[PDB]
Every structure is written in C-alpha cells, then in structure tokens.
Symmetry: C2
C-alpha cells in the first residue's frame, strides 16, 4: 500500500496530490472500513410478506 501510494504520488502535479488523497481516504477507506459491513446482510435480512417459495 505504502509503495503503491508513494510511487503514484511522486509522479503527480499539484492538483494530482489533492485528487489522490480524496480517492484514498474518502473513497477507498470508507468503502473498506465502513460501507462493506453495512451491506453485509442485504439479502439475509430482506423480508417479504409471503408464503410463496
């Protein structure tokens, strides 16, 4: 992770640096740390008022 982030960051402009942190700490981190477990039981807790298999 550090190697990939360091390499990509070096070959970037001023806007490329502010874009890089937005992509990582606010998109990858949120999806990995918070969002993934929110969708854990999407089908398990899907409840339908029916008796039809």
């Amino acid at each position: 992770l550090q190697t990939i982030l360091g390499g990509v960051n070096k070959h970037s402009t001023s806007i490329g640096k502010i874009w890089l942190t937005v992509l990582f700490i606010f998109r990858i981190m949120i999806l990995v740390v918070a969002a993934k477990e929110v969708w854990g039981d999407e089908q398990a807790d899907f409840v339908c008022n029916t008796l039809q298999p």
Copy 2:
C-alpha cells in the same frame, strides 16, 4: 286441509328431500369451510 295431490304429496316429499340432503350429506361438506380456508400470506 284442502290440498290437492301435489299439495300434500309432491310438496311434502320435496321438503323432506331438502332436509335429508341438509342433515345427512350437506352439513359435513361445509364442516371445515374456515379450517381448510388457505391464504398465501404471512399477515395475521
């Protein structure tokens, strides 16, 4: 009192016929009308 042939024979026989159907056969056909009423739902 002053009934004709159909008044006291064909009308009394048909009346007994309806009672016989009701008590001997028909009543138990309707025995489980609600017990065997089945709906596809989970709603109490």
